[PDB]
From a paper:
More than 70 factors participate in the dynamic assembly and disassembly of the small subunit processome (90S) inside nucleolus, leading to the early maturation of small subunit. The 5’ domain of the 18S rRNA is the last to be incorporated into the stable 90S prior to the cleavage of pre-rRNA at the A1 site. The Kre33 module, a subcomplex comprised of Kre33, Enp2, Bfr2 and Lcp5 in yeast, has been shown to act as the last element to place the 5’ domain of 18S11. When bound in 90S, the Kre33 module is observed to hold in place several elements of the pre-rRNA and the 5’ ETS in the assembly phase of 90S.
Numbering used by the authors:
A (entry chain NH): 97 to 274, 282 to 317, 326 to 445, 453 to 983, 1010 to 1116, 1128 to 1237
B (entry chain NI): 3 to 27, 32 to 105, 120 to 189
Amino acid sequence: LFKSNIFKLQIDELLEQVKLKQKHVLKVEKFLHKLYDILQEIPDWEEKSLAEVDSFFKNKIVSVPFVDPKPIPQNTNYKFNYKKPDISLIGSFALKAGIYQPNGSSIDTLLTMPKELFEKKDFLNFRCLHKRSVYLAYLTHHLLILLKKDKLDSFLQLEYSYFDNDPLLPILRISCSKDYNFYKTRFSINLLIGFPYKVFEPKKLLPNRNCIRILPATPLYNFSVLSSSTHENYLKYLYKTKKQTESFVEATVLGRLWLQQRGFSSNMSHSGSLGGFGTFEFTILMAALLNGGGINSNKILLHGFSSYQLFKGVIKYLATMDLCHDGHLQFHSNPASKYIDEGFQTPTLFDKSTKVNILTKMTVSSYQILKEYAGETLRMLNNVVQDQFSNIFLTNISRFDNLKYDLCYDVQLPLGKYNNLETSLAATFGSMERVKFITLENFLAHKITNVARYALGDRIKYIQIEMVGQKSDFPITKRKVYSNTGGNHFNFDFVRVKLIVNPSECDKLVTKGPAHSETMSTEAAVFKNFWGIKSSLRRFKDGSITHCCVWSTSSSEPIISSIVNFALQKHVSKKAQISNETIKKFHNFLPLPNLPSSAKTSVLNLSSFFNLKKSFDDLYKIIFQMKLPLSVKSILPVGSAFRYTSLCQPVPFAYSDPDFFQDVILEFETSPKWPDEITSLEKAKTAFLLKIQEELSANSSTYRSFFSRDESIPYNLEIVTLNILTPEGYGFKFRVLTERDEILYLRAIANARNELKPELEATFLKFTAKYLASVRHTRTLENISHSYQFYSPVVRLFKRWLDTHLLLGHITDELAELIAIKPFVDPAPYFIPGSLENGFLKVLKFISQWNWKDDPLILDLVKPEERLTLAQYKGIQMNFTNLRNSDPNGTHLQFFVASKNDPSGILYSSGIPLPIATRLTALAKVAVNLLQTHGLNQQTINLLFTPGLKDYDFVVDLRTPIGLKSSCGILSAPSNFPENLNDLSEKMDPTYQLVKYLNLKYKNSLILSSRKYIGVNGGEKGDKNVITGLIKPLFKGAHKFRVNLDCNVKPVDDENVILNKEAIFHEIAAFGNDMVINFETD
Amino acid sequence: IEDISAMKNGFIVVPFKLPDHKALPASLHFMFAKRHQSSNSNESDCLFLVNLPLLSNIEHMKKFVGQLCGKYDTVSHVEELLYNDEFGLHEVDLSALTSPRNTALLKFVDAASINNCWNALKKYSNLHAKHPNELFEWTYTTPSFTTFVNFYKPLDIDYLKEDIHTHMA
């Protein structure tokens, strides 16, 4: 099988990044044997009560981190004595769970509180937690003396730590810092004092039965009590499943790779953090799948599945799982294993005879994000078109938090002391409510998630929260792990909620909300209270009643922050301000069109582009209705009006914008009677074209027309193009393209000499550079623009960043426009386009991944469920390999612009300089690193938008009087077409045309590099032309003596001279005298 | 620099003194002129130019050898002048493809009429530093926006319709 063979080759290269060492295993085994010998020296202490435990280790240097509240004799209804410690060779080393990944790992030890200290009568109302902590505090004195025989204190240290961000669960910190040292293993340890086996019955550990009976469903207290009681039974069942299944090690390796790709581990997930689905979850999910017993009690998998077969099976079963809102599972010790389809809308898999809810550590809110990622993972596993087998498994979701998350709302939680928790937080919990939500990260986050579900509703695809400031190191000298986190005695500094929002259902800002009727709906009546004061029940469009939620959408700020400010201060509490400052800092820095309601409408609204497209469609329908003596075929637009994804939208009545003209290609009928010459065919085909150009100003006087030759094409300036001007002054380019260029390159190319043999096909290459399949490309771009509305703002942010960096002027524009749709059409192996900054960061990461010197780029145009097959992509891969073999440095074609309609790869990637592309790729990687290092603010937004613009041959600093900022639409009122074509051309800034003419004349020696978006780079001024100097090595020194080579060889040396710097400066003196600021010799 | 105004390829260089503005670094526009003898009419007892400076004008190429005109009052005739390109895009014409080297306009009809023009410029090649005051300051015109205005303006319909009607037969 190809799937069972190519997957092993794709995983073995990355297997060295998580490989193990035999010397590290031997050092870990020696450290574990020394730790087991140290733990065997802890004997049973005397019979002690709570007061006698306070007589032993109250004011001790080594005291246990007791679970909340503080250790007092108020609830001392039982005793508390240190018992005999029990240790075994179990934990992460029992199944080799430790993996030496790039981020490392840790280990686990078989440690628990004995039955002499923990009792089933003290399990109710959390009385056994104080008894086990006092026993651990009494045994900590023996741990610092009798069990401190590791003999590695020079390289290792002993400390107390909290497990899973909870003070009740401890973690033993005995590892070598950066005899019993684990420096070769480079891993940590974790051990606590939990309840014994079958200490709590399943009736007492039921979902309705809380261990801390203060009772509601304990999401953390009952889950940890069931986990501590049946950890060894679950580990023995997992070891028996790993012994029965030969490919269980490969399934656990694929499960760890998928958990690393998802950025999730076996930590807490229902406590407002990322975790749950990790090594502990995959050890039970793959065991239950291999043992069978699904929702229909059928065999989900077996031990006979292959390594790639079980990896594809686990990827398919991840999206097809039923644990949170679609079912539950129930496994015995090893008597049976069966599941059900009872969706409880909460993650819970209550085991049959093991007596543990497996999914209780996770949450349905985290499962909603998990099911969304697993659906794309199962779709990518089913897809066999892209060769991202190693890419998808190694792409961590949490590696790029800015790219993978569209928006994040973070606030500072000043929790204060124990008597100051009611100031910033208003999560009023009663008796049973504080039993289930004792933590401030549990009570306030559940109130925030309930407020978000009631107000936004369908406007959030998933819920993810984080509580920064939780102390992990348990203070042995103090009571527990409590630090000054945001001015709080408790460990809770800041709260951040990741806005995982589906953009289709979150596009409502001020519209109908909760529907009301004659019957008083509880959601509709309390919609005003749920949305702050916003969603009062009003009328609807169809005569019904619906709430009117109030949210503000801005082109310079985020709409999530306005929705949060409207639906939290008047709904929960006004003491918190969760917003994204970088979203407002980047959207304000992003350019916007000069049209009405520009700040009122967001980036998803394209009414200005739709109005410009409707005016172009009405002009095209009038042209199609008009008939002349010469028959035509079609008139298709491929310009900015047909694109609607540029740096700026269609501004109202732009006079002299850089993208003011919308290109429309018009094709005539079959006219092969014209001659093969370009001038002869143009004169033969203009019998009715001159009459059509004259009559277009009369029959279509609302628009305009012209007849001018275009000099943009190489060696072709004998055409007649209509410079159509709208009644408001909007530009359009009705260009008529003939078939004489392809006929001359095919049939009339024999007349070309040796100086024109390679240029014989250049006439057809210039004609097909923007007219080969641009009509089909513009037709297919309407579905992409309708699907990915945020891709237009991402392309706008990418074009504005390229204009500010000034590194997009040495290439074409078709390749730059088609490269921004990769992160939206092909989101794998990352997130889809949800934000403009996230889309631009993913585009820079994709450009950095597609290294032009290493791997030529290749892509296929796939419609949103068109796509090319692997055999169809084999020709593009062969053309990219042939281009890489011909140009390893990529001097003529660095990155291959390969598409379905461009299988050659050099359709729009010809003439790009290798050092300019290498400098642009290095600057983009530096700016992505600088934006991540500068936090999330305007400095990080300007980290990718402030080039140095210095240390070049010519410094980019000019002063010109031809200011055309208002005519270009870039602000610091025209509403009609200009009087003359020369006056309209003089209204624009000619400094960019003079810089381009100087760069074209001196492209061999002194290239005046600039940006493609002249209007975006100009901005407020729009007059000075930035010309970065790129100097060849023959601009100041000496070259070979060749006066017949048409070079600038003159007397500086005898004959061995180069293009002289003083001669080049005097040559460019008159060209730059109108904008004379700063330029000199090389 | 200015005194070194001769080439070993048979070219006497006329170093044109130019006004060093803020687009330059008294600038020495280094341009050479080699006495060519071939089938071209510009080589008929004249010197083919080399290393032609950019930003040409009506008499900017004559001002490159203007030390001969500024001292000897050069008066002559003209036969031909070629190998001059504004941007190098004239090598492959549109109609030509579908169906000396870097020389400016520094040439004459012969050598007897150019004894005050070409022979004086050869004398001014050695006297580029001796007669720099006789050499004219090459302060050519600034690049105005009218050239870019006329380039981007629409063309006349009747200018192409008359050629289309003439070539229709």
